[PDB]
């Protein structure tokens, strides 16, 4: 058929790893797009499968948050050395959006940066580099230190 269900696989904390996990998945099953909703509590990874045209990764996280939990997901800033024709940025946004355990990925055309809002346990910079390398651009970190070199 048509439709292209995404998977989002992210780490959530606060789980008792029984009723809590089940409460999340059941609560998320309230949503229409939520085609399936699973929680590999053994590895503390919430994996939710839904259409990106009803629900929205942001609402998924919001529902987890409203359930009284927190996602181990961080807004890491990156710099981009590929865009120009306002096209690569759009594609990279729509990619980075949900590589695996990415909640969000807004791009800036002011400083040619991307904030990647993702789970650094499930994925890591190397994946980002390898992905963008596949898109055929080069991806830089915004400092990744802020002059914190000591010895």
PDB file of C-alpha atoms in Angstrom:
ATOM      1  CA  UNK A   1       0.000   0.000   0.000  1.00  0.00           C
ATOM      2  CA  UNK A   2       1.065   3.660   0.291  1.00  0.00           C
ATOM      3  CA  UNK A   3       2.099   5.368   3.593  1.00  0.00           C
ATOM      4  CA  UNK A   4       5.617   5.166   5.116  1.00  0.00           C
ATOM      5  CA  UNK A   5       5.459   4.517   8.853  1.00  0.00           C
ATOM      6  CA  UNK A   6       8.550   5.723  10.687  1.00  0.00           C
ATOM      7  CA  UNK A   7      10.215   4.061  13.628  1.00  0.00           C
ATOM      8  CA  UNK A   8      11.692   6.295  16.326  1.00  0.00           C
ATOM      9  CA  UNK A   9      14.020   4.503  18.816  1.00  0.00           C
ATOM     10  CA  UNK A  10      14.999   6.624  21.862  1.00  0.00           C
ATOM     11  CA  UNK A  11      16.036   6.075  25.530  1.00  0.00           C
ATOM     12  CA  UNK A  12      13.563   7.193  28.239  1.00  0.00           C
ATOM     13  CA  UNK A  13      14.244   7.336  32.016  1.00  0.00           C
ATOM     14  CA  UNK A  14      12.023   7.108  35.115  1.00  0.00           C
ATOM     15  CA  UNK A  15      10.708   3.706  33.979  1.00  0.00           C
ATOM     16  CA  UNK A  16      10.035   1.096  36.677  1.00  0.00           C
ATOM     17  CA  UNK A  17      10.296  -1.165  33.568  1.00  0.00           C
ATOM     18  CA  UNK A  18       6.870  -2.784  33.923  1.00  0.00           C
ATOM     19  CA  UNK A  19       3.601  -0.823  34.361  1.00  0.00           C
ATOM     20  CA  UNK A  20       5.442   2.450  33.545  1.00  0.00           C
ATOM     21  CA  UNK A  21       6.696   1.243  30.180  1.00  0.00           C
ATOM     22  CA  UNK A  22       3.294  -0.324  29.427  1.00  0.00           C
ATOM     23  CA  UNK A  23       1.541   2.922  30.494  1.00  0.00           C
ATOM     24  CA  UNK A  24       3.660   4.871  28.020  1.00  0.00           C
ATOM     25  CA  UNK A  25       3.014   2.478  25.110  1.00  0.00           C
ATOM     26  CA  UNK A  26      -0.710   2.255  25.958  1.00  0.00           C
ATOM     27  CA  UNK A  27      -0.891   6.067  26.334  1.00  0.00           C
ATOM     28  CA  UNK A  28       0.917   6.498  22.998  1.00  0.00           C
ATOM     29  CA  UNK A  29      -1.481   3.936  21.390  1.00  0.00           C
ATOM     30  CA  UNK A  30      -4.176   6.602  22.044  1.00  0.00           C
ATOM     31  CA  UNK A  31      -2.728   8.459  19.007  1.00  0.00           C
ATOM     32  CA  UNK A  32      -4.019   7.571  15.492  1.00  0.00           C
ATOM     33  CA  UNK A  33      -0.623   7.556  13.718  1.00  0.00           C
ATOM     34  CA  UNK A  34       0.836   5.207  16.365  1.00  0.00           C
ATOM     35  CA  UNK A  35       0.777   2.022  14.343  1.00  0.00           C
ATOM     36  CA  UNK A  36       2.857   0.178  16.919  1.00  0.00           C
ATOM     37  CA  UNK A  37       4.475   1.233  20.225  1.00  0.00           C
ATOM     38  CA  UNK A  38       7.107  -0.896  21.978  1.00  0.00           C
ATOM     39  CA  UNK A  39       9.589  -0.470  24.799  1.00  0.00           C
ATOM     40  CA  UNK A  40      12.653  -2.664  24.991  1.00  0.00           C
ATOM     41  CA  UNK A  41      12.760  -2.036  28.753  1.00  0.00           C
ATOM     42  CA  UNK A  42      15.545  -4.638  28.927  1.00  0.00           C
ATOM     43  CA  UNK A  43      17.726  -1.997  27.202  1.00  0.00           C
ATOM     44  CA  UNK A  44      15.510   0.950  28.361  1.00  0.00           C
ATOM     45  CA  UNK A  45      14.760   1.893  24.712  1.00  0.00           C
ATOM     46  CA  UNK A  46      11.280   3.163  23.778  1.00  0.00           C
ATOM     47  CA  UNK A  47      10.640   2.369  20.087  1.00  0.00           C
ATOM     48  CA  UNK A  48       7.488   3.895  18.584  1.00  0.00           C
ATOM     49  CA  UNK A  49       6.227   3.272  15.031  1.00  0.00           C
ATOM     50  CA  UNK A  50       3.804   5.837  13.495  1.00  0.00           C
ATOM     51  CA  UNK A  51       3.025   7.881  10.325  1.00  0.00           C
ATOM     52  CA  UNK A  52       4.753  11.340  10.064  1.00  0.00           C
ATOM     53  CA  UNK A  53       1.415  12.926   9.026  1.00  0.00           C
ATOM     54  CA  UNK A  54      -0.930  12.552  11.985  1.00  0.00           C
ATOM     55  CA  UNK A  55       1.085  12.446  15.198  1.00  0.00           C
ATOM     56  CA  UNK A  56       4.671  13.781  15.054  1.00  0.00           C
ATOM     57  CA  UNK A  57       7.884  12.786  16.878  1.00  0.00           C
ATOM     58  CA  UNK A  58       7.531  16.018  18.927  1.00  0.00           C
ATOM     59  CA  UNK A  59       4.045  14.959  20.096  1.00  0.00           C
ATOM     60  CA  UNK A  60       5.357  11.434  20.801  1.00  0.00           C
ATOM     61  CA  UNK A  61       8.041  12.888  23.085  1.00  0.00           C
ATOM     62  CA  UNK A  62       5.478  15.320  24.512  1.00  0.00           C
ATOM     63  CA  UNK A  63       3.203  12.398  25.451  1.00  0.00           C
ATOM     64  CA  UNK A  64       6.142  10.623  27.187  1.00  0.00           C
ATOM     65  CA  UNK A  65       6.900  13.884  29.028  1.00  0.00           C
ATOM     66  CA  UNK A  66       3.203  14.322  30.038  1.00  0.00           C
ATOM     67  CA  UNK A  67       3.236  10.683  31.255  1.00  0.00           C
ATOM     68  CA  UNK A  68       5.839  11.928  33.808  1.00  0.00           C
ATOM     69  CA  UNK A  69       9.109  10.671  32.257  1.00  0.00           C
ATOM     70  CA  UNK A  70      12.162  12.231  30.542  1.00  0.00           C
ATOM     71  CA  UNK A  71      13.958  11.338  27.287  1.00  0.00           C
ATOM     72  CA  UNK A  72      17.782  11.141  27.279  1.00  0.00           C
ATOM     73  CA  UNK A  73      17.817  13.381  24.179  1.00  0.00           C
ATOM     74  CA  UNK A  74      20.103  16.425  23.701  1.00  0.00           C
ATOM     75  CA  UNK A  75      20.178  19.433  21.344  1.00  0.00           C
ATOM     76  CA  UNK A  76      23.728  19.112  19.992  1.00  0.00           C
ATOM     77  CA  UNK A  77      24.703  21.959  17.628  1.00  0.00           C
ATOM     78  CA  UNK A  78      26.501  21.199  14.346  1.00  0.00           C
ATOM     79  CA  UNK A  79      27.819  23.341  11.450  1.00  0.00           C
ATOM     80  CA  UNK A  80      27.251  22.343   7.775  1.00  0.00           C
ATOM     81  CA  UNK A  81      29.740  22.704   4.869  1.00  0.00           C
ATOM     82  CA  UNK A  82      27.564  21.459   1.966  1.00  0.00           C
ATOM     83  CA  UNK A  83      24.493  23.649   1.533  1.00  0.00           C
ATOM     84  CA  UNK A  84      24.212  26.675  -0.740  1.00  0.00           C
ATOM     85  CA  UNK A  85      21.169  26.268  -3.008  1.00  0.00           C
ATOM     86  CA  UNK A  86      18.714  26.212  -0.051  1.00  0.00           C
ATOM     87  CA  UNK A  87      18.213  22.522  -1.026  1.00  0.00           C
ATOM     88  CA  UNK A  88      20.859  20.465   0.787  1.00  0.00           C
ATOM     89  CA  UNK A  89      19.670  22.088   4.033  1.00  0.00           C
ATOM     90  CA  UNK A  90      16.054  21.077   3.363  1.00  0.00           C
ATOM     91  CA  UNK A  91      17.052  17.496   2.511  1.00  0.00           C
ATOM     92  CA  UNK A  92      19.418  17.228   5.499  1.00  0.00           C
ATOM     93  CA  UNK A  93      16.601  18.523   7.752  1.00  0.00           C
ATOM     94  CA  UNK A  94      14.182  15.908   6.403  1.00  0.00           C
ATOM     95  CA  UNK A  95      16.892  13.231   6.812  1.00  0.00           C
ATOM     96  CA  UNK A  96      18.379  14.183  10.214  1.00  0.00           C
ATOM     97  CA  UNK A  97      14.728  14.608  11.381  1.00  0.00           C
ATOM     98  CA  UNK A  98      14.602  10.870  12.096  1.00  0.00           C
ATOM     99  CA  UNK A  99      17.861   9.022  11.328  1.00  0.00           C
ATOM    100  CA  UNK A 100      17.145   6.585  14.221  1.00  0.00           C
ATOM    101  CA  UNK A 101      16.881   8.178  17.686  1.00  0.00           C
ATOM    102  CA  UNK A 102      16.540  11.810  16.617  1.00  0.00           C
ATOM    103  CA  UNK A 103      13.640  13.714  18.151  1.00  0.00           C
ATOM    104  CA  UNK A 104      14.205  16.866  16.052  1.00  0.00           C
ATOM    105  CA  UNK A 105      16.710  18.425  13.640  1.00  0.00           C
ATOM    106  CA  UNK A 106      16.042  22.135  12.834  1.00  0.00           C
ATOM    107  CA  UNK A 107      18.456  23.746  10.324  1.00  0.00           C
ATOM    108  CA  UNK A 108      19.525  27.442  10.318  1.00  0.00           C
ATOM    109  CA  UNK A 109      20.245  29.399   7.130  1.00  0.00           C
ATOM    110  CA  UNK A 110      21.718  32.281   9.187  1.00  0.00           C
ATOM    111  CA  UNK A 111      24.936  30.539  10.315  1.00  0.00           C
ATOM    112  CA  UNK A 112      24.542  27.387   8.136  1.00  0.00           C
ATOM    113  CA  UNK A 113      24.132  25.204  11.260  1.00  0.00           C
ATOM    114  CA  UNK A 114      21.895  22.282  12.264  1.00  0.00           C
ATOM    115  CA  UNK A 115      20.773  21.586  15.804  1.00  0.00           C
ATOM    116  CA  UNK A 116      20.457  17.779  16.016  1.00  0.00           C
ATOM    117  CA  UNK A 117      18.131  16.923  18.927  1.00  0.00           C
ATOM    118  CA  UNK A 118      18.925  13.226  19.408  1.00  0.00           C
ATOM    119  CA  UNK A 119      19.790  10.377  21.767  1.00  0.00           C
ATOM    120  CA  UNK A 120      23.613  10.005  22.187  1.00  0.00           C
ATOM    121  CA  UNK A 121      23.263   6.445  23.612  1.00  0.00           C
ATOM    122  CA  UNK A 122      21.298   5.087  20.634  1.00  0.00           C
ATOM    123  CA  UNK A 123      23.370   6.972  17.977  1.00  0.00           C
ATOM    124  CA  UNK A 124      26.546   9.155  17.911  1.00  0.00           C
ATOM    125  CA  UNK A 125      28.366  11.792  15.779  1.00  0.00           C
ATOM    126  CA  UNK A 126      30.035   9.070  13.655  1.00  0.00           C
ATOM    127  CA  UNK A 127      26.567   7.993  12.418  1.00  0.00           C
ATOM    128  CA  UNK A 128      25.746  11.637  11.631  1.00  0.00           C
ATOM    129  CA  UNK A 129      28.986  12.029   9.682  1.00  0.00           C
ATOM    130  CA  UNK A 130      28.424   8.693   7.865  1.00  0.00           C
ATOM    131  CA  UNK A 131      24.807   9.694   7.053  1.00  0.00           C
ATOM    132  CA  UNK A 132      25.676  13.169   5.742  1.00  0.00           C
ATOM    133  CA  UNK A 133      28.613  11.645   3.856  1.00  0.00           C
ATOM    134  CA  UNK A 134      25.922   9.494   2.170  1.00  0.00           C
ATOM    135  CA  UNK A 135      23.861  12.640   1.413  1.00  0.00           C
ATOM    136  CA  UNK A 136      27.167  13.870  -0.090  1.00  0.00           C
ATOM    137  CA  UNK A 137      27.924  16.837   2.195  1.00  0.00           C
ATOM    138  CA  UNK A 138      30.355  17.386   5.090  1.00  0.00           C
ATOM    139  CA  UNK A 139      29.100  18.019   8.612  1.00  0.00           C
ATOM    140  CA  UNK A 140      31.046  19.870  11.360  1.00  0.00           C
ATOM    141  CA  UNK A 141      30.550  20.195  15.136  1.00  0.00           C
ATOM    142  CA  UNK A 142      29.837  23.655  16.617  1.00  0.00           C
ATOM    143  CA  UNK A 143      33.066  23.799  18.644  1.00  0.00           C
ATOM    144  CA  UNK A 144      32.258  20.700  20.774  1.00  0.00           C
ATOM    145  CA  UNK A 145      34.302  22.297  23.601  1.00  0.00           C
ATOM    146  CA  UNK A 146      33.789  26.095  23.664  1.00  0.00           C
ATOM    147  CA  UNK A 147      37.544  26.528  24.137  1.00  0.00           C
ATOM    148  CA  UNK A 148      37.619  23.878  26.918  1.00  0.00           C
ATOM    149  CA  UNK A 149      41.189  22.711  26.268  1.00  0.00           C
ATOM    150  CA  UNK A 150      43.193  22.503  29.541  1.00  0.00           C
ATOM    151  CA  UNK A 151      45.946  19.896  29.221  1.00  0.00           C
TER     152      UNK A 151
END
